[PDB]
């Protein structure tokens, strides 16, 4: 009666237990793909992030100067 | 009883003396345990019948679980978290068995000791020997795992114990 009226069977737990650990470890290689990936793009900068300002060439006027030579 | 496998549990066919009264006093034992059993058995062998009709009333039954084999330890890759889980909860299932198949072997070696008497020394060598085998391989599977075991660890102690055992059987053969 008690097994009956407050509680489940092995398998729901079992179950919930396969998927949270799936959930968990999933986020555990995510963490540290997450962290290499972070050490390539600062090291190299040839992706999104570290992206850092550099002269807006729009800016350079590009006519006579009075000069030849520029 | 029913209620026991014999074979698991068994018993010698017990073999018991019959009266022989050399004297024709009577033995106090004889007229008490019948006074007993006319004042106690009877009386609780009917309230059992009782009992046991109102049981019989309502029967219903329960069953026994039967779980499945699954991949162990061994072929489980080095990360697959589900495969490890599954492995882990047979392991620990296979341990909780051994242990009670230990203590199955201990039982039957304390039977024996009480029942054979003061000859339990000679008597009882069939039971010492096979506690002595079964505690040698619980022993080789799960002696000094300490706490936090687990199927790895018992695998890389079996791993460790089977290369040991590989160089020696090698030194042997090139001795
Ligand atoms: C001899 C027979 C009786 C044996 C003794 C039994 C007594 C049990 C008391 C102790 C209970 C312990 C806790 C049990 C409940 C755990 C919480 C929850 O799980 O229980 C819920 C039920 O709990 C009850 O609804 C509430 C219990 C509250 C008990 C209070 C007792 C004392 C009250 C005293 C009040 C007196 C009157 C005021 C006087 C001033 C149902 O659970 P549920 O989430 O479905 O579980 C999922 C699995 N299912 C679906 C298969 C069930």
Redesign the pocket.
Known sequence: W?A?????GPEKNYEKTMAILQIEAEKAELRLKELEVRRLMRARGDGPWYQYPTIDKALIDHSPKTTPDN | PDSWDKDVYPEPPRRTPAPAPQTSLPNPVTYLTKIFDLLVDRPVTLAREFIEQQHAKNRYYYYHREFRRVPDITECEEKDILCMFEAEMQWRRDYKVDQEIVNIIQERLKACQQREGESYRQNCAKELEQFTQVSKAFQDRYSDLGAHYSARKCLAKQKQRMLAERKAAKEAAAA
């Open positions: 008690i009956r009226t407050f509680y489940d």
